[PDB]
Symmetry: none
Subunit: 387 residues, 4 copies
Amino acid sequence: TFFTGETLGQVDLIVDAVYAGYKTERGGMADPLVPLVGVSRQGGFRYRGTRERPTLLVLTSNLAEPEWPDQLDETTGTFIYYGDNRHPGRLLHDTPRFGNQLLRQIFDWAHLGQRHLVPPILVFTTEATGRTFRFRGLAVPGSPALAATEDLVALWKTTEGQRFQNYKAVFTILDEAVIPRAWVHAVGRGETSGLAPVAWNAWLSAGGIRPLMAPRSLLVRSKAEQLPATPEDQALIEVIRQRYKENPFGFEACAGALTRLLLPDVARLDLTRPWRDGGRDGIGRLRIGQSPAAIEVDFALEAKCYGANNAVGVKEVSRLISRIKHREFGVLVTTSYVDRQAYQEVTDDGHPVILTTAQDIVGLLRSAGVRTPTQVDAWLDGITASV
Amino acid sequence: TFFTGETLGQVDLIVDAVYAGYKTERGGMADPLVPLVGVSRQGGFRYRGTRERPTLLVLTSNLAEPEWPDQLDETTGTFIYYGDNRHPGRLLHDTPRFGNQLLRQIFDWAHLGQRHLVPPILVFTTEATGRTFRFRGLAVPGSPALAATEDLVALWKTTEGQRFQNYKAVFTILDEAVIPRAWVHAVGRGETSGLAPVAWNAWLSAGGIRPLMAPRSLLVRSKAEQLPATPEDQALIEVIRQRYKENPFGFEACAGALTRLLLPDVARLDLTRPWRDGGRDGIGRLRIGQSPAAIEVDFALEAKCYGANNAVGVKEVSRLISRIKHREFGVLVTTSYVDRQAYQEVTDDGHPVILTTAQDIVGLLRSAGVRTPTQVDAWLDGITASV
Amino acid sequence: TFFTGETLGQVDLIVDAVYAGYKTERGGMADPLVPLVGVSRQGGFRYRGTRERPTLLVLTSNLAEPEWPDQLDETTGTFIYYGDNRHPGRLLHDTPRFGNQLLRQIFDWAHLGQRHLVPPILVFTTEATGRTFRFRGLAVPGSPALAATEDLVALWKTTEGQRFQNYKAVFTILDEAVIPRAWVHAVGRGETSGLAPVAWNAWLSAGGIRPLMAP
Amino acid sequence: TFFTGETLGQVDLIVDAVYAGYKTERGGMADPLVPLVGVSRQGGFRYRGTRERPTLLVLTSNLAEPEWPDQLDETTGTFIYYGDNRHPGRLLHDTPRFGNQLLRQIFDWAHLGQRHLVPPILVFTTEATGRTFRFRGLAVPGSPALAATEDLVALWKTTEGQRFQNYKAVFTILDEAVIPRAWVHAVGRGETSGLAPVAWNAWLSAGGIRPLMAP
């Protein structure tokens, strides 16, 4: 499932298949989406037809951007895509290539009962070896799990002393393994076609969405994956490790805060509970559902403030495991990584234990708008002062 | 505790205490917020000081508007507040009394690191009997459980073929049982005061939020609470009942969709699993956390399509319970209500069973954007098509 | 209970009986299903005949795989079985031994009323010791508790960064304690036979399923 | 290790001993903690002396309340005890019997190194039937595993849409199997006594918490 040369004028669009460019003349790299789809060679988002009436829309994403965290949830087939107003100075819909206007118009159509105007959305993600793209699926606006009003939202971003709006758009990948290029090019030329995938026609007629849901097989992460890659994030975690060197137990509070960011409530927290080994037995309460229709489940918290050179092993994990006997699950927050043996034991024995490692802390901090050591410091000041 | 009359010029602001207006002349009520707070006579939101530099802000809500569902999450202290652009034809920030510009400015200050410009926000909810307000607390912009960018978002709402933008703001109630009227009036006028509540100063300095979290005690709902009130809603549910009378199973698919709306991932669904009584063992899979740091827990689904005259009783619930062996929890979705004995048997014991009744289905439908029987029919068509 | 060696070429197929492979020199166990039913030596999906006209269908599972949780409900006689595309990189229907194509075809036939095209399906589960199988019964596509659209479904799974598609199939074990090896081998060879168990014939004519339910 | 009647005016307070009964005129059940200790006849918390300077404090708990889960950990000897404001309508420190105020005064005292102002705390748990209590021990405010801010906290609860505040207080049981009734009664009367158990004096001088841990 790797396509490079003239094959791009023949092969269909296959989910998670890789479509690579080729060298033409003098350093010029041919964009594969041109023969594969028929769009232009340029944008991060590309369309056919006019902007007022687009016939087909191609969305590409790097997934390397921490500023605008586009993401494809393989599990639910949900694709989160951020708009094209990425810096201060211009209003929401005023962009050079009009991506926000496009998004607005598409969601307008989808919501107003005119789905026939909505162009097929083809999602691609860059593998970033020269110019290559992995096809992620055919998508529709909205989601079966979201409120109607929350599928296209305008967020306020703050960068270098200024406030500007940008779109966060939610799409759902339809359950289709193969998208006929005949259909793509036909619709792209403005033609009417009967080669439309069943899920697409279904969405057209009824408005309903059949998502491509691909739950992850059991995963054991490596050391590199759990620890930050860049030195900056490493500095970020280091600030945390330094904050609690004089008061280790205090880190639990921090863990708690991180937990509230990670978890679908605001977890209730009881961090002050003397346990048998002289340490504390931190516990939490989580609500599942939406009151009046919801239940509460309890979890045990375990926080290990370690250096990256010191792994979390079988012993540390076994503490938490022993603490989750009468509780639904456990969360383990650590500024380091969990070694092979412990991870393997946890995934294999099916223990309900969340493993939040250093990289995860970095991500959670990113979502909280903390990208710099000073910001980490202020954040920690906030935690210590608020508990 | 209850307060009215001249005492509104003396007593402090107490969480969940009731402040009632008194008859002066016309047969209408003198608004209690004028003597108690010092704000003007009327408003959905009221502020002292200027528009550009408000010294104090009072947010009131009736919690009775289904189209703009302001919400006080008592468990977590989160207050969701909807902006003042509630009809089409006007730009987001262009409103008669400038609520959205005000919210914009407040969150701007909070985000740009200027919290000394942010006025204390006082939250009141209407008791709907005469003109009275229960005081909910002192609030700050934002939440410790949310991403930075999502504390103030612009939603698109659809009305009569038109689409307009409106604000959704997230606030958090600080942990303070009593807010001093001396401090409130001082800041209102306003001058420097040292009477500021500790949590407020804490937020001013470090940016940390110490939320008032008051988990709900064990509750058993009544028949009237579980069932819809207005006849329109009753009609909405009746459409669902009529839709499946020729095919009783397959309402399981509907219950599965509603489940996907109720639950914090998009739950994976396996509805086709022959069970011992000749029926099915519907199960789902739900993710807690954010991958790579997340776990999956499974649940048992039980779908009971009943008329409002037939309660879900001990036996059906028992079927669910039996199906919960070797599973984390269970969800019961029903177009009717659960009788006293069954509800009591569920809450008294430790059964992790979510009870989704008719009113809850009504709510989930509101959030999906379905308020009319035609729309219910379109929705159902979508469900049947998408399974 | 308990058959091995030469007896694998003599005795019938009995539900819950254990058929054990025997040691051969140089390289370990010989598969018991070869002398028993007459299929190929390996695979979790085995068949006789051709792709276009399968004569016999053997399904084996260990019930120990968490990624593909095959299931055997002795209360309803229901057998939930997963397809043979278990690694990323290939489309649902594209498998070396053509298991998914066969499943799709068999279920299509079953749903259309073409029951006479559906080969007998023998279900085995693996046991403790090396290369042994406990026979669970003769089975048919579908379930009395499921509609046609419900008994064969395509599921997705993400291994590494790649999503791939595979089949989840629902079968029902027929109420027959003994399945004649004469019928098995006759049918497998492509011969036409009248030795079919009663429940199978009832399925062929009436379309009705008498499941094997444990008391 | 079971005492009743006249015995309640004789024996000492012993850890794990049960103090029960007893029957009286009409249907009245006499409270054992009255002859045994000298406090009042009821209250989830009872005390002697002024509320401004309490001489002796008795805490009882059934450990049967899910809404206010009082907990006694025998591994660490830790006693988690909830305040006396259990219903909406009153502020945290405004209660009929003034328990939360007492708790606050006690804990602030302990925090300031003013241990000598802290009255002895006797912990009893209710058993099964009738009016009976199991004596769990003599306890001091706080824990060797907790900082000062951590041992007394305010919690919130929502009931009937109304939110109210209550106290979660952590005590630690001192390692003493037997507490002299002479000492208890002497202290309760406000007299100076030198009969205090060694762990209590060690807490007074150093503090210095020697917890009672089950082997």
